[PDB]
Structure formats: structure tokens, C-alpha cells
Design a binder for this molecule. Sequence first.
Ligand SMILES: Cn1c(=O)c2[nH]c(SCCN3CCC(C(=O)O)CC3)nc2n(C)c1=O
Length: 498
Amino acid sequence: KKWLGTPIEEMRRMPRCGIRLPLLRPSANHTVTIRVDLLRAGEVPKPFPTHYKDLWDNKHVKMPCSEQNLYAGSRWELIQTALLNKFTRPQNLKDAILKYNVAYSKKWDFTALIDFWDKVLEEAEAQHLYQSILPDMVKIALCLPNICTQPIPLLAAAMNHSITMSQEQIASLLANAFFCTFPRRNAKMKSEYSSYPDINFNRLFEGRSSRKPEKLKTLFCYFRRVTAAAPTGLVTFTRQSLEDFPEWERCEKPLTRLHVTYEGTIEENGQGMLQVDFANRFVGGGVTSAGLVQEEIRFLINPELIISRLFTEVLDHNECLIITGTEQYSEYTGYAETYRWSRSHEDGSERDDWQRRCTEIVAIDALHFRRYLDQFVPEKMRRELNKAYCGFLRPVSSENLSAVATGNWGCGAFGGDARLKALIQILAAAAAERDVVYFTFGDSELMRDIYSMHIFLTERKLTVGDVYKLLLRYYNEECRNCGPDIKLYPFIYHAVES
Ligand SMILES: Cn1c(=O)c2[nH]c(SCCN3CCC(C(=O)O)CC3)nc2n(C)c1=O
């Protein structure tokens, strides 16, 4: 069988399962950068306010077009002069970017940008790039003060706050990131913003990996689309930080339903579900540098995700980032060394009443384990449970919650055990009262094992706490004084049947 458990057709999805959205309005915990009274399907949203307002401080994005962005001369004037030149060769673009980044002219390498333009693209593609795409990217970047007129607060640690902005505003900001115009975001030894991810794209231009051309094709697909015809929708970015976490050993909740399959993907087969991003604590991971695994791929085919890096501080253990409304612009094949851009993608997702695509993605960062046994330590298991729980919980009735679409979170490079991490997500979803749709990405044996454990536990009516106590026993009996002699799932079967 290609899938096991509850049919996926019986799982809840957006928009059909959602509650009527309240009226979109700014508030103390919701920044809204567009005119809600003029928001209409198929119309480009109007920025609010009408005239640029600047905030240059430690609570807001430092905009490149700020009159306080100085070097004293105006850095924004310098950016304008540098970018409003014909490009005909990749060195022209390098030289332009470095005119307002002089301190980094010896530090930033542009080999991948030069190789892409000169050595990957055929002549006609290169010509289209410098005659049409790059000039159009410059124009939308330089339009920033007319597009992003409202200060953008930082989603800082411990903040429970949301930003809703237009896809068009995101395009202007991402064009600026491409041209590396965001100030104070560059120095390796920075104090300010040291707890924020990279946003400027300079590391996309360095080195000779065969990955970078594929990353650039994926991003230029997006840039070509959104400069040719402005997207009309909205995107919400919500930082969520919980303080009340379950007493896992005493939770009497039953497990919820499971669909597990070794075929399909989160982004295609989990349409309308809560889609997990296997994130780095710096959201987006290496998307703007060398990474090209699950999180980076998603940030490339849905580039509006990338802008979360402009304003999202590194996630603490009790926090996540929820992004609603990003659009898929590319299709791809493979991953890492085999990742390839395939073609442009026309997103068919419905939009909700806030004109957001009905696509909800949650970034939750797993721990990186130096030693395999480290992850069975109770404090580490509880950490992962609470992280997933924070990502899944919507402080909303269970009937209005979509299923969670996820997979082997934190496995591969971070050393997580897929069978443990699957069980941890199942418990967290149960506590948040959501069903689970689990993609094993080609591993048929894992699919069978997860299904078998799930139905074993549910048929015996074990609670979340019952299972968590079994994890603690496994640690104590097979890990603390110990790889272990007995694997986790066999241990559980034996303990319960005994
Ligand atoms: C359910 N699910 C996935 O699990 C998934 N994984 C990926 S790429 C992950 C390749 N990465 C390479 C380096 C390795 C190391 O360095 O250890 C580890 C693994 N795309 C995915 N999608 C779309 C999906 O739906």
C-alpha cells in the first residue's frame, strides 16, 4: 500500500474547515500595512499610510530608504545612482552592488552570479536577464518608499505579534534584498541584528556550487513573475510564543488520526493543511547561502517566505513562526545536490477573506544532536514536544483546525531519530487536537512502522501521557546508563504487552 491509516480525504483542510475570519484591522498585536477598507479581490492593495513614514530604531526594520541611512551622505541616493545604470555584463551588477557596500568589496565573492550569467545561461536568457528582469527588479526596489510606507516592527523574541502586508510590498523588499541594500545586516561581528538571519542575498552570489544556478533560476522565476504583473494578495507573519505548556506525563488526551504515506510531498499533497517547515532557529536556514534541504527549497519555491528573515528574530525554545498566504511560483525536482528548478508554477490555491492564499506554513526548529542518544534525554524530548505543540496550537475549536502535514522533522543532518520524532509530533498534534498527515519521502518501511505503532497505541486507548511515560522509561532503561540495545518501538510494544 502507498498509504496507511485514515484516508487523506477525511482530513480537515482550509478553507473548507476554517471559521469566518474577523475583520482585518491593525491593533496592538497586528501590524497591517495596507488599506483594509480598499482591499478587493484581484486589485493591487493600496499601502497605508499614503506617504512614507520612517522609524529608525531598535524595534523596527532599518529601511534602506530612511533619511537616517547614511555613510555624511545619503545611502539611498547612492543606491539609486548605482542601480540606475545599464547592465550588460555581470561585473556591472557586482560593481553596482559594491558601490554602496564598499566595506565588503574584498569580503563578498560574486563567482556564482558571474558563472550563472556567463556560463549557465544561453545568450538569449542572459539578454532577457539584463535587458528586462534586472531593470524591472531595480525599479520595484527603488519604489520602496512608495510601496512600504509603514514602519515594519521586528518580530523579536517573546513577542506575540503579527504583520500582514501585500505580496507587492514583499516583492519590493525582496528586490532590495537581492541588491543587498538593507543596512546593518552585513557585518560578521555585528551586535545589532546578530540574533536575526541574513537578509541581503550576497552569499547567493559566492562560490561554484552547482546548486547556486538552480537557486538563482528559482528566484529569477519569481522576480520575473512579480515584476511583470503585481501579485494582488496578502501575507501574514505571526510570531507565537507560549508560556503554558502541557504536563505531558499527566495529559489524558487520546491520540488523533493518522494518514501516513511514502509518496507525495507536504507542499503538494498537504494543500490546505498546516504545513511544517523543518526550520533552523534562524528561519529559512541557508536559503540565501548554501543550504538546499526541505526548508530552503520551500523558501525558494515560495520566496515570500524569505522576507520573514528581514524581521524575525532567532526562535527561542518556546516559539514558532506561522506564515499564511505565501504563493508557490516554481516547481522543482530533487534536493541538495540533485535539486533542479523545473518550471514556473501557477498557484491555484483559493484565497481567504483577507486575500491570503489558503496556504499556512509553520517554522519549527528541531534540535541538532551531537550524539544520537542525546535526544532521548527527557529534557530534550520535552523540548521537542513543546516546540511542535507551540507550532500546532491555535489559541480555535478543534473542528476548525486543519490536519498537520509533516514528516521526518529534524532527521538527516540534525541527527533526529525518525521513529521518535514521528511519535513526538503525533503526541503534540494530539495535545493540540489536530490530526496528522505524515510523509516519509520514499521510506516505505518507516510508513509501516509509524502506522503500526499508531494503531497499536490507539487500539489500546493509551493517552498522550501514557505514551510520554513510556518514552521516559525507554530513556531510563535503555539510554541513560548505555546506540541502545533495543530500539524504541520494540521497547514500547514489549512494555505495553507486558
Ligand atoms: C516530507 N518531506 C520531506 O521529508 C522532505 N525532505 C526534503 S529535502 C531533505 C534532504 N537532506 C539532505 C542532507 C541530509 C544530511 O545532510 O543529513 C539530510 C536530508 N524535501 C522534503 N519534502 C518536500 C517533504 O515533503
